[PDB]
Design a protein around this ligand. Structure first.
Ligand SMILES: NC(=O)c1ccc(N2CCOCC2)nc1
Length: 338
Protein backbone atom coordinates (compact mmCIF):
# COMPACT_ATOMS: atom_id res chain seq x y z
CA UNK A 1 0.00 0.00 0.00
CA UNK A 2 2.97 2.29 0.60
CA UNK A 3 3.92 2.02 -3.08
CA UNK A 4 0.32 2.31 -4.25
CA UNK A 5 -0.20 5.49 -2.27
CA UNK A 6 3.14 6.93 -3.44
CA UNK A 7 2.20 6.38 -7.07
CA UNK A 8 -1.34 7.73 -6.56
CA UNK A 9 0.09 10.99 -5.20
CA UNK A 10 2.68 11.12 -7.97
CA UNK A 11 -0.08 10.84 -10.56
CA UNK A 12 -2.24 13.48 -8.88
CA UNK A 13 0.65 15.96 -8.89
CA UNK A 14 1.63 15.15 -12.47
CA UNK A 15 -1.92 15.53 -13.77
CA UNK A 16 -2.37 18.95 -12.15
CA UNK A 17 0.70 20.30 -13.98
CA UNK A 18 -0.12 18.32 -17.13
CA UNK A 19 -3.53 19.95 -17.43
CA UNK A 20 -2.24 23.50 -16.72
CA UNK A 21 1.33 23.66 -18.07
CA UNK A 22 3.70 26.45 -17.21
CA UNK A 23 4.69 28.72 -20.09
CA UNK A 24 7.07 31.60 -20.79
CA UNK A 25 8.89 31.59 -17.44
CA UNK A 26 12.15 33.24 -18.55
CA UNK A 27 13.70 34.90 -21.58
CA UNK A 28 16.96 34.57 -23.47
CA UNK A 29 18.68 37.76 -22.31
CA UNK A 30 18.35 36.62 -18.68
CA UNK A 31 21.31 34.31 -19.43
CA UNK A 32 24.94 34.40 -20.54
CA UNK A 33 26.10 31.75 -22.97
CA UNK A 34 29.12 29.72 -21.77
CA UNK A 35 29.66 26.67 -23.99
CA UNK A 36 27.97 24.34 -26.45
CA UNK A 37 27.64 20.91 -24.80
CA UNK A 38 26.01 19.06 -27.71
CA UNK A 39 24.55 19.59 -31.19
CA UNK A 40 21.86 17.81 -33.17
CA UNK A 41 19.92 18.09 -36.43
CA UNK A 42 17.32 20.52 -35.03
CA UNK A 43 18.78 21.64 -31.71
CA UNK A 44 21.67 22.11 -29.31
CA UNK A 45 22.33 22.05 -25.59
CA UNK A 46 24.23 25.01 -24.14
CA UNK A 47 25.74 25.68 -20.77
CA UNK A 48 24.34 29.05 -19.66
CA UNK A 49 24.56 31.21 -16.55
CA UNK A 50 21.69 33.20 -15.09
CA UNK A 51 22.88 36.78 -14.94
CA UNK A 52 21.06 37.74 -11.71
CA UNK A 53 21.39 34.56 -9.61
CA UNK A 54 24.67 33.21 -11.00
CA UNK A 55 23.19 29.71 -11.31
CA UNK A 56 24.27 27.50 -14.17
CA UNK A 57 21.78 25.66 -16.37
CA UNK A 58 21.73 23.50 -19.46
CA UNK A 59 19.63 25.22 -22.12
CA UNK A 60 18.16 23.08 -24.88
CA UNK A 61 17.56 25.22 -27.99
CA UNK A 62 15.28 23.93 -30.76
CA UNK A 63 15.02 25.66 -34.15
CA UNK A 64 11.29 25.80 -34.95
CA UNK A 65 11.77 25.66 -38.71
CA UNK A 66 13.96 22.55 -38.42
CA UNK A 67 11.53 20.87 -36.00
CA UNK A 68 8.72 21.27 -38.55
CA UNK A 69 10.92 20.06 -41.41
CA UNK A 70 12.03 16.96 -39.48
CA UNK A 71 8.40 16.30 -38.40
CA UNK A 72 9.11 16.68 -34.67
CA UNK A 73 6.34 19.17 -33.80
CA UNK A 74 4.26 16.84 -31.63
CA UNK A 75 7.43 15.36 -30.11
CA UNK A 76 8.81 18.75 -29.03
CA UNK A 77 5.44 19.69 -27.54
CA UNK A 78 5.40 16.31 -25.74
CA UNK A 79 8.90 16.86 -24.37
CA UNK A 80 8.17 20.20 -22.76
CA UNK A 81 4.68 19.39 -21.51
CA UNK A 82 5.93 16.20 -19.85
CA UNK A 83 9.11 17.72 -18.40
CA UNK A 84 7.31 20.63 -16.77
CA UNK A 85 4.91 18.13 -15.13
CA UNK A 86 7.14 15.35 -13.77
CA UNK A 87 9.04 15.14 -10.49
CA UNK A 88 11.32 12.21 -9.64
CA UNK A 89 14.84 11.95 -8.13
CA UNK A 90 16.41 10.49 -11.28
CA UNK A 91 14.88 12.87 -13.88
CA UNK A 92 16.65 16.08 -14.89
CA UNK A 93 14.56 19.01 -13.64
CA UNK A 94 13.11 21.61 -15.99
CA UNK A 95 13.59 25.05 -14.46
CA UNK A 96 12.27 27.40 -17.21
CA UNK A 97 10.86 27.30 -20.71
CA UNK A 98 10.08 29.94 -23.34
CA UNK A 99 10.11 30.58 -27.09
CA UNK A 100 10.94 33.49 -29.39
CA UNK A 101 10.55 34.21 -33.13
CA UNK A 102 12.95 31.39 -34.11
CA UNK A 103 13.52 28.90 -31.27
CA UNK A 104 12.07 26.86 -28.43
CA UNK A 105 14.02 26.84 -25.15
CA UNK A 106 14.05 24.39 -22.25
CA UNK A 107 16.32 25.46 -19.37
CA UNK A 108 17.29 22.40 -17.31
CA UNK A 109 19.40 21.76 -14.21
CA UNK A 110 23.01 21.36 -15.35
CA UNK A 111 24.53 17.97 -14.47
CA UNK A 112 28.33 18.47 -14.63
CA UNK A 113 29.34 14.78 -14.38
CA UNK A 114 28.65 14.08 -18.04
CA UNK A 115 27.03 11.21 -19.87
CA UNK A 116 27.17 7.67 -18.58
CA UNK A 117 28.30 6.86 -22.14
CA UNK A 118 31.61 8.70 -21.67
CA UNK A 119 32.39 6.97 -18.37
CA UNK A 120 31.44 3.53 -19.72
CA UNK A 121 33.64 3.93 -22.79
CA UNK A 122 36.48 5.24 -20.61
CA UNK A 123 36.43 2.32 -18.14
CA UNK A 124 35.41 -0.31 -20.71
CA UNK A 125 32.62 -2.01 -18.82
CA UNK A 126 30.97 -1.71 -15.43
CA UNK A 127 31.05 -4.44 -12.80
CA UNK A 128 27.69 -6.06 -12.15
CA UNK A 129 27.21 -4.15 -8.86
CA UNK A 130 27.96 -0.88 -10.69
CA UNK A 131 25.58 -1.71 -13.58
CA UNK A 132 22.96 -2.81 -11.03
CA UNK A 133 23.17 0.49 -9.13
CA UNK A 134 22.31 2.42 -12.32
CA UNK A 135 19.78 -0.18 -13.53
CA UNK A 136 17.85 0.07 -10.23
CA UNK A 137 17.43 3.79 -10.77
CA UNK A 138 16.06 3.18 -14.27
CA UNK A 139 13.67 0.51 -12.92
CA UNK A 140 12.22 2.97 -10.39
CA UNK A 141 12.12 5.78 -12.96
CA UNK A 142 10.17 3.62 -15.42
CA UNK A 143 7.87 2.47 -12.60
CA UNK A 144 7.12 6.16 -12.02
CA UNK A 145 6.78 7.17 -15.68
CA UNK A 146 4.70 4.16 -16.68
CA UNK A 147 2.28 4.76 -13.80
CA UNK A 148 1.69 8.23 -15.32
CA UNK A 149 0.92 6.59 -18.70
CA UNK A 150 4.26 7.92 -20.01
CA UNK A 151 6.62 5.95 -22.27
CA UNK A 152 10.18 7.24 -22.44
CA UNK A 153 11.35 5.69 -25.77
CA UNK A 154 14.99 6.86 -25.80
CA UNK A 155 16.89 4.84 -23.18
CA UNK A 156 20.62 4.71 -24.01
CA UNK A 157 23.85 5.59 -22.16
CA UNK A 158 24.07 9.05 -23.74
CA UNK A 159 20.79 10.07 -22.10
CA UNK A 160 21.84 9.18 -18.55
CA UNK A 161 23.87 11.89 -16.87
CA UNK A 162 25.90 11.25 -13.72
CA UNK A 163 25.34 13.86 -11.02
CA UNK A 164 27.52 15.14 -8.18
CA UNK A 165 26.49 12.21 -5.95
CA UNK A 166 27.16 9.61 -8.64
CA UNK A 167 23.46 9.06 -9.30
CA UNK A 168 21.64 9.04 -12.65
CA UNK A 169 19.62 11.89 -14.15
CA UNK A 170 17.67 10.93 -17.25
CA UNK A 171 17.86 13.64 -19.89
CA UNK A 172 16.22 14.17 -23.27
CA UNK A 173 12.46 13.64 -23.30
CA UNK A 174 12.32 14.29 -27.05
CA UNK A 175 10.55 10.99 -27.72
CA UNK A 176 8.60 10.74 -24.44
CA UNK A 177 4.83 10.51 -24.83
CA UNK A 178 1.67 10.13 -22.77
CA UNK A 179 0.04 6.97 -24.11
CA UNK A 180 -2.99 5.04 -22.93
CA UNK A 181 -2.78 1.76 -24.78
CA UNK A 182 -0.64 1.73 -27.92
CA UNK A 183 1.39 4.16 -29.99
CA UNK A 184 2.98 3.77 -33.44
CA UNK A 185 5.77 6.27 -34.16
CA UNK A 186 9.09 5.00 -35.40
CA UNK A 187 11.61 6.64 -33.07
CA UNK A 188 14.49 5.76 -30.79
CA UNK A 189 18.04 4.72 -31.52
CA UNK A 190 18.62 1.58 -33.64
CA UNK A 191 20.64 -0.48 -31.13
CA UNK A 192 17.90 0.00 -28.51
CA UNK A 193 14.73 -0.54 -30.57
CA UNK A 194 12.38 -3.31 -29.51
CA UNK A 195 11.29 -5.79 -32.22
CA UNK A 196 7.73 -4.47 -32.27
CA UNK A 197 8.98 -0.97 -33.15
CA UNK A 198 11.09 -2.37 -36.01
CA UNK A 199 8.09 -4.34 -37.29
CA UNK A 200 5.77 -1.25 -37.27
CA UNK A 201 3.35 -2.60 -34.66
CA UNK A 202 1.27 -0.66 -32.20
CA UNK A 203 3.48 -0.83 -29.13
CA UNK A 204 3.41 0.09 -25.45
CA UNK A 205 5.60 0.53 -22.36
CA UNK A 206 7.15 -2.89 -23.00
CA UNK A 207 9.57 -1.16 -25.39
CA UNK A 208 11.16 0.65 -22.44
CA UNK A 209 11.75 -2.64 -20.63
CA UNK A 210 13.38 -4.12 -23.76
CA UNK A 211 15.62 -1.06 -23.89
CA UNK A 212 16.56 -1.61 -20.23
CA UNK A 213 17.76 -5.09 -21.19
CA UNK A 214 19.89 -3.53 -23.92
CA UNK A 215 21.25 -0.96 -21.46
CA UNK A 216 22.11 -3.50 -18.77
CA UNK A 217 23.82 -5.71 -21.34
CA UNK A 218 25.85 -2.75 -22.67
CA UNK A 219 26.81 -1.56 -19.18
CA UNK A 220 28.02 -5.02 -18.18
CA UNK A 221 29.70 -6.04 -21.46
CA UNK A 222 30.94 -2.70 -22.77
CA UNK A 223 29.00 -3.03 -26.03
CA UNK A 224 25.35 -3.52 -26.93
CA UNK A 225 23.95 -6.97 -27.72
CA UNK A 226 22.85 -6.15 -31.30
CA UNK A 227 25.60 -4.33 -33.23
CA UNK A 228 26.38 -3.86 -36.93
CA UNK A 229 27.51 -1.30 -39.50
CA UNK A 230 24.08 -0.72 -41.06
CA UNK A 231 20.76 -0.26 -39.21
CA UNK A 232 19.11 -3.01 -41.29
CA UNK A 233 21.73 -5.47 -40.05
CA UNK A 234 21.08 -4.37 -36.45
CA UNK A 235 17.36 -4.83 -37.02
CA UNK A 236 17.78 -8.37 -38.36
CA UNK A 237 19.62 -9.36 -35.17
CA UNK A 238 17.05 -7.71 -32.91
CA UNK A 239 14.09 -9.53 -34.44
CA UNK A 240 15.89 -12.91 -34.49
CA UNK A 241 15.52 -13.85 -30.84
CA UNK A 242 19.23 -14.69 -30.50
CA UNK A 243 21.65 -13.04 -28.07
CA UNK A 244 25.14 -14.18 -27.07
CA UNK A 245 26.31 -13.42 -23.54
CA UNK A 246 29.93 -12.92 -22.41
CA UNK A 247 31.13 -15.79 -20.27
CA UNK A 248 31.86 -13.34 -17.43
CA UNK A 249 28.13 -12.58 -17.04
CA UNK A 250 26.60 -14.13 -13.93
CA UNK A 251 23.85 -16.71 -14.43
CA UNK A 252 21.43 -14.31 -12.70
CA UNK A 253 22.30 -11.52 -15.16
CA UNK A 254 21.84 -13.80 -18.15
CA UNK A 255 18.47 -14.96 -16.84
CA UNK A 256 17.24 -11.39 -16.29
CA UNK A 257 18.40 -10.32 -19.75
CA UNK A 258 16.66 -13.24 -21.48
CA UNK A 259 13.42 -12.03 -19.89
CA UNK A 260 13.93 -8.35 -20.75
CA UNK A 261 15.24 -9.12 -24.28
CA UNK A 262 12.21 -11.29 -24.89
CA UNK A 263 11.13 -10.76 -28.49
CA UNK A 264 7.52 -11.75 -27.67
CA UNK A 265 6.27 -8.64 -25.93
CA UNK A 266 3.47 -10.57 -24.17
CA UNK A 267 6.17 -12.59 -22.33
CA UNK A 268 8.59 -9.75 -21.59
CA UNK A 269 9.43 -8.79 -18.01
CA UNK A 270 7.77 -5.54 -17.09
CA UNK A 271 4.77 -6.34 -19.30
CA UNK A 272 3.31 -9.28 -17.34
CA UNK A 273 0.52 -9.35 -14.77
CA UNK A 274 3.02 -8.66 -11.97
CA UNK A 275 4.42 -5.66 -13.86
CA UNK A 276 7.62 -4.17 -12.52
CA UNK A 277 7.79 -6.58 -9.57
CA UNK A 278 8.95 -9.39 -11.84
CA UNK A 279 12.07 -7.25 -12.33
CA UNK A 280 12.43 -5.90 -8.80
CA UNK A 281 12.14 -9.43 -7.29
CA UNK A 282 14.53 -11.06 -9.73
CA UNK A 283 17.62 -12.71 -8.21
CA UNK A 284 19.92 -10.26 -10.03
CA UNK A 285 18.44 -7.47 -7.84
CA UNK A 286 18.53 -9.47 -4.59
CA UNK A 287 21.09 -7.07 -3.07
CA UNK A 288 19.14 -3.91 -4.06
CA UNK A 289 17.44 -1.89 -1.33
CA UNK A 290 14.88 -0.15 -3.52
CA UNK A 291 13.90 2.42 -0.91
CA UNK A 292 17.54 3.24 -0.11
CA UNK A 293 18.19 3.83 -3.84
CA UNK A 294 15.14 6.10 -4.12
CA UNK A 295 16.28 8.03 -0.99
CA UNK A 296 19.83 8.31 -2.48
CA UNK A 297 21.27 6.71 0.67
CA UNK A 298 23.42 4.14 -1.19
CA UNK A 299 27.05 5.10 -1.74
CA UNK A 300 27.61 5.38 -5.46
CA UNK A 301 30.12 3.36 -7.52
CA UNK A 302 31.97 6.54 -8.41
CA UNK A 303 31.67 10.30 -8.24
CA UNK A 304 32.53 12.15 -11.46
CA UNK A 305 35.59 14.38 -11.29
CA UNK A 306 34.64 18.02 -11.81
CA UNK A 307 35.73 21.30 -10.26
CA UNK A 308 32.40 23.05 -9.73
CA UNK A 309 28.94 23.78 -11.14
CA UNK A 310 30.44 25.57 -14.15
CA UNK A 311 32.94 22.87 -15.12
CA UNK A 312 32.45 21.50 -18.64
CA UNK A 313 35.40 19.07 -18.63
CA UNK A 314 33.14 15.98 -18.76
CA UNK A 315 31.48 17.18 -22.00
CA UNK A 316 33.19 17.51 -25.32
CA UNK A 317 34.01 20.29 -27.75
CA UNK A 318 31.71 21.57 -30.51
CA UNK A 319 31.87 24.45 -32.96
CA UNK A 320 30.33 27.52 -31.31
CA UNK A 321 27.48 28.74 -33.53
CA UNK A 322 25.17 31.77 -33.24
CA UNK A 323 21.83 31.69 -31.45
CA UNK A 324 20.10 33.76 -34.14
CA UNK A 325 16.61 35.13 -33.49
CA UNK A 326 14.73 36.26 -36.60
CA UNK A 327 13.08 39.65 -36.84
CA UNK A 328 9.91 37.77 -37.91
CA UNK A 329 7.98 35.08 -36.04
CA UNK A 330 8.34 31.57 -37.47
CA UNK A 331 5.84 28.74 -37.04
CA UNK A 332 3.77 30.60 -34.46
CA UNK A 333 0.64 28.50 -34.98
CA UNK A 334 2.47 25.18 -34.75
CA UNK A 335 3.98 25.95 -31.33
CA UNK A 336 1.18 27.98 -29.75
CA UNK A 337 0.94 25.71 -26.70
CA UNK A 338 4.67 25.73 -25.98
N1 LIG B 1 21.01 18.66 -18.38
C1 LIG B 1 22.29 18.71 -18.71
O1 LIG B 1 23.20 19.06 -17.91
C2 LIG B 1 22.66 18.31 -20.12
C3 LIG B 1 23.98 18.45 -20.50
C4 LIG B 1 24.39 18.03 -21.75
C5 LIG B 1 23.44 17.46 -22.60
N2 LIG B 1 23.82 16.94 -23.82
C6 LIG B 1 22.88 16.86 -24.94
C7 LIG B 1 23.37 15.84 -25.95
O2 LIG B 1 24.69 16.15 -26.41
C8 LIG B 1 25.59 16.15 -25.32
C9 LIG B 1 25.20 17.17 -24.28
N3 LIG B 1 22.15 17.35 -22.27
C10 LIG B 1 21.78 17.77 -21.05
Amino acid sequence: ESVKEFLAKAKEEFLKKWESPSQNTAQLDHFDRIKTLGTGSFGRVMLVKHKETGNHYAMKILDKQKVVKLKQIEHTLNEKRILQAVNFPFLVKLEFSFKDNSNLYMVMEYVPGGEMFSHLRRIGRFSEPHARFYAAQIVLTFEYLHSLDLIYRDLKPENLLIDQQGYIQVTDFGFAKRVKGRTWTLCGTPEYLAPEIILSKGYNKAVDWWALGVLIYEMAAGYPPFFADQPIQIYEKIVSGKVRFPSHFSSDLKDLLRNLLQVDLTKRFGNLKNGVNDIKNHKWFATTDWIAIYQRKVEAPFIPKFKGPGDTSNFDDYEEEEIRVSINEKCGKEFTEF
